[PDB]
Every structure is written in C-alpha cells, then in structure tokens.
Amino acid sequence: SGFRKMAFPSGKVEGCMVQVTCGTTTLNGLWLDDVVYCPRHVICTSEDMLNPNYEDLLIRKSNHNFLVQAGNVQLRVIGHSMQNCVLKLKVDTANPKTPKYKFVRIQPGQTFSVLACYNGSPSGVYQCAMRPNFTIKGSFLNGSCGSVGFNIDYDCVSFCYMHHMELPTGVHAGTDLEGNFYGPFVDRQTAQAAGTDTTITVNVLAWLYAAVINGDRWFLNRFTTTLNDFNLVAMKYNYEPLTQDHVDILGPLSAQTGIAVLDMCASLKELLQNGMNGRTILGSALLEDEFTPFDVVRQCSGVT
Amino acid sequence: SGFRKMAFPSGKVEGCMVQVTCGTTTLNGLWLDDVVYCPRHVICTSEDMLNPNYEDLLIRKSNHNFLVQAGNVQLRVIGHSMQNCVLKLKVDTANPKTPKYKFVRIQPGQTFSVLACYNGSPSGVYQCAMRPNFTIKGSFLNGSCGSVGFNIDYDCVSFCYMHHMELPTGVHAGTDLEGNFYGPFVDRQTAQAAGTDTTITVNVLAWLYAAVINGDRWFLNRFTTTLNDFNLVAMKYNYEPLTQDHVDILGPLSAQTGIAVLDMCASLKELLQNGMNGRTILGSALLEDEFTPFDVVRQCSGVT
Ligand SMILES: *CC(=O)N1CCN(Cc2cccc3c(CCNC(C)=O)c[nH]c23)CC1
Numbered sequence: 235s236g237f238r239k240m241a242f243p244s245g246k247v248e249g250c251m252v253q254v255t256c257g258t259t260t261l262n263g264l265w266l267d268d269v270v271y272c273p274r275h276v277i278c279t280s281e282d283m284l285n286p287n288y289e290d291l292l293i294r295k296s297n298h299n300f301l302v303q304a305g306n307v308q309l310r311v312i313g314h315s316m317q318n319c320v321l322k323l324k325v326d327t328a329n330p331k332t333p334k335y336k337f338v339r340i341q342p343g344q345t346f347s348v349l350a351c352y353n354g355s356p357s358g359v360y361q362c363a364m365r366p367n368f369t370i371k372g373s374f375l376n377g378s379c380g381s382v383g384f385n386i387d388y389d390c391v392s393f394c395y396m397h398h399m400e401l402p403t404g405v406h407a408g409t410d411l412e413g414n415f416y417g418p419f420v421d422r423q424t425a426q427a428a429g430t431d432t433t434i435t436v437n438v439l440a441w442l443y444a445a446v447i448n449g450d451r452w453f454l455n456r457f458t459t460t461l462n463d464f465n466l467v468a469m470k471y472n473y474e475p476l477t478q479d480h481v482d483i484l485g486p487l488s489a490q491t492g493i494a495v496l497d498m499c500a501s502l503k504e505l506l507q508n509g510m511n512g513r514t515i516l517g518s519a520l521l522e523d524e525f526t527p528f529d530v531v532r533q534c535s536g537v538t
Numbered sequence: 539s540g541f542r543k544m545a546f547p548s549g550k551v552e553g554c555m556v557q558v559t560c561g562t563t564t565l566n567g568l569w570l571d572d573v574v575y576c577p578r579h580v581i582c583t584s585e586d587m588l589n590p591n592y593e594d595l596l597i598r599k600s601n602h603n604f605l606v607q608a609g610n611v612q613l614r615v616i617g618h619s620m621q622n623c624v625l626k627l628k629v630d631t632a633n634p635k636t637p638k639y640k641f642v643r644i645q646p647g648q649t650f651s652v653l654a655c656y657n658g659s660p661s662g663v664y665q666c667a668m669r670p671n672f673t674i675k676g677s678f679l680n681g682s683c684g685s686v687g688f689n690i691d692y693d694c695v696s697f698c699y700m701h702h703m704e705l706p707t708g709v710h711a712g713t714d715l716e717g718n719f720y721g722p723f724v725d726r727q728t729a730q731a732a733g734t735d736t737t738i739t740v741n742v743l744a745w746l747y748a749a750v751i752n753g754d755r756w757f758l759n760r761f762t763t764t765l766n767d768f769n770l771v772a773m774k775y776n777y778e779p780l781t782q783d784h785v786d787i788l789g790p791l792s793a794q795t796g797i798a799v800l801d802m803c804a805s806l807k808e809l810l811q812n813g814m815n816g817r818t819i820l821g822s823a824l825l826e827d828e829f830t831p832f833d834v835v836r837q838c839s840g841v842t
C-alpha cells in the first residue's frame with residue numbers, strides 16, 4: 235500500500251537523449267533510429283526569438299551546422315527538415331539503444347512522465363498531467379527544451395510531449411513528436427494566453443478511489459448525487475463536467491471498492507462545498523487531479 | 539522555473555534489477571558486479587514469517603535453490619551468505635550494466651529516489667525522504683521487496699535503501715545495502731512501533747526558499763525570530779529543532795534570495811501558528827518537508 239506521484243522508469247528514454255547545438259544555442263534532442271528530433275527554435279538566437287521566420291532561419295543552416303552529441307560521441311548529420319515546430323536531423327547511425335516506441339498525441343487530462351534534461355544529460359524524472367488548457371505545470375530551466383514526456387506500456391515507449399517554452403506565467407508549453415503544439419501556443423517570445431484551466435474531475439474521483447483502497451476513508455458520506463446535480467457543483471468550482479464516458483472509465487475502481495461512482499461524486503461534492511476542514515487525503519491538503527483512473531489501477535495492482 | 543517532486547533518472551538502477559526466487563517466494567534483487575543483493579526473507583514462507591530463525595532457514599538452502607533471473611537470462615549462483623538482513627548471492631557473471639556505485643547509509647531527513655519493482659521488472663520511480671523516525675512513506679505492494687532507494691551524483695549511484703516491509707500502519711521499513719535496518723525494525727511479522735515522527739524543519743525552510751525563487755512569496759512577512767524562539771514553536775508543532783548546522787546548510791539559498799535564514803524562520807513560524815488560510819505554496823496546501831536544501835539548489839540551478 236501507499237500512494238505516490240510515480241513516474242515511469244526513465245531508462246529507455248535516457249538512452250535516446252542527445253545534445254543538439256546550432257550556432258550558440260544548445261538544447262536536447264531525442265535520437266530514435268537514424269533521426270534526432272528537437273525543437274526548431276534550436277536555430278534561433280535571442281535576437282530572433284521575438285518574431286522568428288523559421289523557414290528563412292533554417293535556410294541559412296546546413297547539416298554541418300547541427301552539432302549532435304550523444305554523451306561523448308558525435309553524430310554525423312546527413313539530412314535536416316522542419317515538420318511543424320520540430321526539426322528532424324537524419325544521422326548516419328541508428329541509435330543502438332532505441333526502444334520500441336510510438337509517437338502519440340495525448341488528450342487533455344491524461345498523464346505522462348517527463349525526463350528533464352540539460353545538454354543531453356538527464357537530470358530528473360517527474361509525473362505531469364496535460365492540463366485541460368493544454369499547458370503542463372513542469373519544472374524546466376533554460377536548456378531543458380527538447381526534454382520529452384512519455385508513457386511506457388511494458389516494452390513500448392509512447393512519446394507524447396517535447397518541451398518548447400515557458401509562458402510568462404511560469405507554466406509550460408510544448409508539442410507532440412510531430413511538432414504540433416498542444417494548445418494555442420506558438421514558438422515565439424510573445425505574450426500568450428493560456429486558457430482558463432479546470433480541475434480534471436475524473437482524476438480527482440480516481441484519486442478518491444485510491445484513497446479508499448489505501449485506507450483514507452474519512453471523506454466517504456451517506457449521500458449520493460446525479461450527474462446533473464454533480465455538474466452544477468463542478469461548474470461552480472471550475473471542475474470539468476463529468477460525462478458517462480468518465481463514469482465508465484471509473485467502472486473498475488467502482489467495482490473493486492464497491493462504491494458507486496455517483497456516491498463517490500457525492501463525497502467529492504461535499505469536499506468541494508466544505509473544504510477538507512484541515513484534514514488530508516493521501517498526504518495531500520488539496521484535491522489531487524494528476525492521477526488518471528488508469529494510473530490508480532496500475533499503482534494499486536502492481537503493473538510493470 | 540516550476541517546482542516538482544523530482545526523482546533521479548532510474549536507468550542506471552533498472553540495469554541492476556533481477557528477480558530472485560527461493561522456493562515459492564519471489565522478490566527483487568540488485569545485481570552489482572558478481573553479487574546479487576536481496577532481502578533475506580526471500581528464504582521464508584508465510585508459515586515462517588511470524589518468528590523466523592533465519593540462520594536455520596538459510597541452512598536448508600543451497601546455491602541451486604536461489605533462482606536469479608535478469609530479465610530472461612538465468613544467473614548461475616556460486617555462493618550465498620547472509621549479512622545482517624540481506625542475502626548476497628555470488629553469481630558467475632559480473633553485471634555488464636553495473637554503474638559506478640557506492641553503498642551509503644543515509645541520515646534521517648535526507649531524500650532519495652525509489653525504483654519500485656515487481657518480479658525484477660521496474661514499474662515506477664518516485665522521490666522519498668527517510669523520515670526522522672526511520673520509516674519511509676512509499677508506494678509498495680507485495681512483491682516490491684528488494685526494490686532499492688538511491689541518489690545519483692553525475693555517474694555514481696549511491697544505494698542507500700532496500701525495501702523489506704510494510705508496518706501494520708502502512709508506512710515502510712527497510713535496510714541500508716549492508717542489511718542493517720533503518721530504525722528499530724526487525725524483519726518479522728510482528729507489531730512494530732514506528733517512533734513519533736517529526737517534520738523535517740530544514741527541508742520545509744529549503745522548500746520555502748524554492749517557493750520564493752519560483753515566485754510564490756505571499757508568506758514572506760516583516761518579522762524575524764531567533765533559533766530559541768523558533769524552536770519553542772517547532773516543539774509545539776512537532777518540527778525538528780533547528781540547529782546552526784541547519785542554518786549553515788541553508789546559507790547558499792539565503793545568499794541567492796537575500797532572505798536571512800531567521801527571517802525565513804519567522805515566515806515559517808507564522809505559517810505554523812496561522813495555517814495557510816486556504817492558499818497554496820508551490821501547488822501544495824501543506825508545508826512540504828521532502829526536499830532537502832541540496833535538492834532545491836539542484837532543481838533550481840539545473841544539475842545533471
Ligand atoms: C526550454 C528552453 O531551453 N528555453 C530557452 C529558449 N527559449 C526560447 C523560446 C522558444 C519558444 C518560445 C519562447 C518564449 C515565449 C514567451 N515566454 C516568456 C517567458 O516570455 C520565450 N522564449 C522562447 C525557450 C525556453
């Protein structure tokens with residue numbers, strides 16, 4: 235027992251990290267097979283960052299301008315191309331440590347692990363959720379760009395994120411591995427509005443189910459509610475409206491604990507309206523929304 | 539910017555994990571060079587767990603009874619010995635993936651990453667602190683025993699923990715890599731008192747410094763305090779007394795932010811006496827104590 239914000243083991247991704255340098259700018263790249271993927275802003279200087287014309291900036295660059303170093307060994311760049319906001323540098327050597335992998339575009343509300351890197355070297359790993367507003371609340375300093383987010387299903391790494399920027403608000407924005415940004419963000423140093431964020435209701439309910447499984451039960455009550463009633467409360471407190479799809483995903487946890495999903499909604503309703511009266515749930519003094527129903531089941535069943 | 543409970547990249551440790559089976563019991567082992575380290579209770583059945591005589595149980599076992607599997611390859615066991623609460627199985631093959639490593643006994647209040655494993659397969663990674671009462675609040679299910687805790691300094695892994703047990707209270711106990719338990723715990727299925735836990739004061743102050751660096755400043759006040767005064771409040775709220783050694787360790791963060799350590803103590807004093815009035819600090823609604831001053835500096839400076 236016990237419940238922690240657990241990230242996937244990062245080994246398979248550490249073996250893919252490389253340093254990409256173009257001119258004076260250095261960031262991280264992801265080496266899979268004979269291709270290195272990195273943010274296209276590796277070709278900018280601070281002089282260009284306010285309003286870059288990426289097509290024009292990339293035209294002044296040749297394969298020999300992209301310096302790719304895997305730890306201490308230099309990769310020979312034999313092709314370069316821009317796809318959306320990523321650069322794909324074809325190298326002459328396939329990464330011997332390339333795991334089985336997929337490129338996936340995750341949905342808002344889903345979670346993933348991030349391997350923060352600096353100069354191609356992994357520094358740490360943590361679990362994130364893609365916010366409903368398509369930002370992530372990460373931990374990224376200058377040089378962390380090109381660090382990736384991923385999920386691991388047995389032997390397969392599904393890469394879902396590459397870090398590109400920090401908003402003036404301190405939240406993070408990035409792309410899928412095809413270079414398409416999550417959200418309305420553009421890779422330009424400009425004021426950018428992150429939309430109104432909401433709390434991921436299905437994840438809070440999943441975490442309440444994890445709390446019951448792990449012993450924390452004080453919040454369970456004698457009440458029930460309806461999806462309509464619950465959603466009136468969800469709206470007042472800026473929670474995502476709960477749908478039957480969310481109830482269906484919570485089915486396994488509802489079955490394991492014997493607590494009907496709408497009964498758990500009534501516990502959540504009372505916690506929203508009354509607060510936690512100074513108590514904690516799974517060591518937290520707030521309602522946690524960064525565990526999906528899949529994460530809770532995995533952490534409570536023991537999947538490797 | 540941004541602040542997260544970040545664990546070390548687990549790659550170097552994933553390459554050391556093996557499955558150890560003895561009779562019907564399976565747990566995890568750590569393969570470093572030609573030795574596999576695992577909890578000695580791998581030789582028990584539930585029939586033995588209430589009051590085992592480990593010396594007698596180990597005498598009924600031969601090298602061929604210890605089945606060690608590294609992923610899909612079987613290791614040949616050529617020696618076995620018990621050191622405190624660990625077994626050391628000498629194998630005929632040195633682990634090709636053995637990183638540079640040390641065995642260290644961490645101090646209470648220090649942090650480390652845990653790579654939770656099942657059947658020799660890594661499932662996830664999270665950051666822990668060794669509680670002042672020598673327990674850890676982890677996430678471990680049956681079969682997780684033998685999972686290890688560690689720190690990573692550039693290329694060197696310092697193994698500090700091996701998981702052995704869950705107390706009836708749900709907290710976790712284990713040993714250093716010489717098999718010596720942290721705390722008064724014994725590897726026997728019996729009622730065991732974890733001492734009174736305290737909050738790691740120097741870590742809460744370190745996390746308040748991380749909050750200031752990352753923008754969360756609402757808690758800073760116009761007050762100061764003394765070590766004596768602060769410690770009267772620390773005692774009332776079950777915080778560890780602050781010493782000059784703790785002030786000295788906070789020196790770098792005090793210098794970086796320009797907030798004198800005793801001024802930060804006065805902010806902490808007011809948070810303890812007044813609570814957080816429904817506000818948050820670094821996304822938390824409670825005072826976080828699982829970041830050391832070293833962790834905060836590493837996460838805020840970018841060390842890989
Ligand atoms: C992650 C990293 O290493 N960074 C250093 C280079 N920075 C360049 C860059 C790229 C795209 C968008 C940028 C913005 C958006 C506005 N943000 C702020 C804080 O003003 C700023 N710099 C950008 C990315 C970060």
Ligand SMILES: *CC(=O)N1CCN(Cc2cccc3c(CCNC(C)=O)c[nH]c23)CC1
Binds near residue numbers: 701706728
């Ligand atoms: C971690 C793991 O895989 N476990 C399964 C085997 N268990 C055996 C064991 C070893 C040492 C001490 C034990 C206790 C102490 C009392 N705890 C409770 C909850 O009653 C129980 N089982 C023990 C360890 C866990």
